[PDB]
Design a protein around this ligand. Structure first.
Ligand SMILES: C[C@@H](c1ccc(C(F)(F)F)cc1)n1nc(CO)c2c(=O)[nH]c(=O)[nH]c21
Ligand SMILES: C[C@@H](c1ccc(C(F)(F)F)cc1)n1nc(CO)c2c(=O)[nH]c(=O)[nH]c21
Ligand SMILES: [Mg+2]
Ligand SMILES: [Mg+2]
Ligand SMILES: [Zn+2]
Ligand SMILES: [Zn+2]
Lengths: 348, 343
């Protein structure tokens, strides 16, 4: 059960981060603003600077007169706010935030959303899985956790906690990046962060799914407030599952990370005398079939809606579909349940 | 189903703050019926209650701003039979009664009691005389804005309260520190959202556990749960009054509910039985509502506060009165004149 222990580095580098100023994105990588960039390739120590670089390149620092030392401290607090499970760690939040930046650069989001909405989307991406324990919402309820005691009646247990952790960082002395905003705009930011983070609960996505389809059918209306809110939910889910839009090496490695995390939850449930979900049981789970189901029923419909709303997003949908075909190829040359004994899918 | 908004002061500035005994010698008693106060005297009574609980002095509230805030809240209610200003006023009066009769200061922080009172005033702002299910069914702008997150009307009531605070010269918390201003908004959000019966149903077991284990003032969750319980006890406080009050409030509630059912039928949808004047049997519905909803809230209050026993006994007595009078109420819906005086 030791593989279920995921530590926090601190409790709920700064001058060093701003010593040479904020780096222009092209200096980080000429491919930084491309859908072919793999943000998980960036060294972890360079991710805080890349966050500042993206906020600078999207002109949020200048447009909102964000204090750079406060932003640097906020970025470091958010990074330190993640534990170290195989998948739900800072590198996942960083990669999700990078995808938000890619949508801004490639889909020209400023023609669909308000500046404040795009800013909130990016901050929400950074914060959206804060303090994740490597377990799902059902586990919180089963383990009778403090998080389930605080939030289980309302659903979205972990997501309500991620939002609460994001707010606690803003409330930390020297970390409130938007404390200069008007009362109306500060409230708008908090409401946006709450809605966007809560949109990462798959149960929420499934409830609003028919409304997202209706919006894609009738066409996006930039004057429709509900369309802005539905679009932010869609974009957030697309950032959260963006590893599926990268190359085969990325989808293969992320299956390794997802199933190492899920199987550790399954082992922990068995230790507690409970029968875990099939996808979390290393003795029952058949990864290629589970991956094909996730891709066909959860990921591909999100990128299909994205393509329906933004023709320039067609390449993302095509890549997700291509990765699904690669998993179908794998299913005719993968004869094991769970992960291999060495916990590696490198042989694929 | 048409209920209007009156819009989009000197009398209050001159004599808005009165000693509560001058309003009525029984003003601070559980046997006072706040609906007996003339509507034109309610804003003065709100200021008088805030003065009597010493919030005006303790929080350095600007009295002209407070008078403007009270007037804005009063104009913020429409005129359906039940969900109007007199309901908000009577709910606010009950909060004042809990402060005066129970030892609230021994359970909650002054800021939380203050937020409870202001939330009582605002908790049904701009109510349309329809429930949350109706907002979704009618595909309203409120449902478009809030249905995906839950508690459509309650999120709207809180948004309306915030809009009043943001109105020129009505911000009663203007001088508060940034941290305290935010605490007030968070408390108002949590307390107003606690008025959705769906929320109460979801947290009942946790309220049932806090009372079983015993109230812990050092437990932040116990403060949150207690505020939810207190807010629902204020919302249903008409049930703690005399039989005449319970009977009149049934006339108001069902005239409003039946108007929603008539509207649903006009839209080609079948309303729930309780909103259908052709199906609803008021005594049976009220006995069920008192057994499942009202009585357990006051029983929890009695378990946490011994002085609250009379509240539960009155609710139980009113439920027994519905059973005894059911033999004389031989019809579904309401009589042609919408009155229950015949009982
Ligand atoms: C954590 C989960 C997940 C998060 C978030 C949402 C949404 F859409 F609701 F935001 C859905 C699902 N998740 N993330 C991945 C990474 O590709 C995978 C995966 O490969 N297989 C899964 O069974 N679940 C996965
Ligand atoms: C509006 C509704 C109601 C509001 C609020 C809450 C709570 F508890 F959640 F706050 C519960 C229920 N309500 N109010 C009354 C008046 O005493 C009655 C009634 O007598 N019969 C009903 O069926 N519903 C009634
Ligand atoms: Mg998450
Ligand atoms: Mg209400
Ligand atoms: Zn995530
Ligand atoms: Zn009410």
């Amino acid at each position: 059960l030791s593989t279920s222990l995921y530590k926090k580095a601190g409790f709920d580098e700064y001058t060093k981060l701003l010593h040479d100023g904020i780096q222009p994105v092209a200096a980080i990588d000429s491919n930084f603003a491309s859908f072919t960039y793999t943000p998980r390739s960036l060294p972890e120590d360079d991710t805080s600077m890349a966050i500042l670089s993206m906020l600078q390149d999207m002109n949020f620092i200048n447009n909102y007169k964000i204090d750079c030392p406060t932003l640097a401290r906020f970025c470091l607090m958010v990074k330190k706010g993640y534990r170290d499970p195989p998948y739900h760690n800072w590198m996942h939040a960083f990669s999700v935030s990078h995808f938000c930046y890619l949508l801004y650069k490639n889909l020209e989001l400023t023609n669909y959303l308000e500046d404040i909405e795009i800013f909130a989307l990016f901050i929400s991406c950074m914060c959206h899985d804060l303090d994740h324990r490597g377990t799902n919402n059902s586990f919180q309820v089963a383990s009778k956790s403090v998080l389930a005691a605080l939030y289980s009646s309302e659903g979205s247990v972990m997501e309500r906690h991620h939002f609460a952790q994001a707010i606690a960082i803003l409330n930390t002395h020297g970390c409130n990046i938007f404390d200069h905003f008007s009362r109306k705009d500060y409230q708008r930011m908090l409401d946006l962060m709450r809605d966007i983070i809560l949109a990462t609960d798959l149960a929420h996505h499934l409830r609003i799914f028919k409304d997202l389809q209706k919006m894609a059918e009738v066409g996006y209306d930039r004057n429709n407030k509900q369309h802005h809110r539905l679009l932010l939910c869609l974009l957030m889910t697309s950032c959260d599952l963006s590893d599926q839009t990268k190359g085969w090496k990325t989808t293969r490695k992320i299956a390794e990370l997802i199933y190492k995390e899920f199987f550790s939850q399954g082992d922990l449930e068995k230790a507690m005398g409970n029968r875990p979900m099939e996808m979390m049981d290393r003795e029952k789970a058949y990864i290629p079939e589970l991956q094909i189901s996730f891709m066909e029923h959860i990921a591909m419909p999100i990128y299909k809606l994205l393509q329906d709303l933004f023709p320039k997003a067609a390449e993302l949908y095509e890549r997700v579909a291509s990765n699904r075909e690669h998993w179908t190829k794998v299913s005719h040359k993968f004869t094991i349940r769970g992960l291999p004994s060495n916990n590696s899918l490198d042989f694929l």
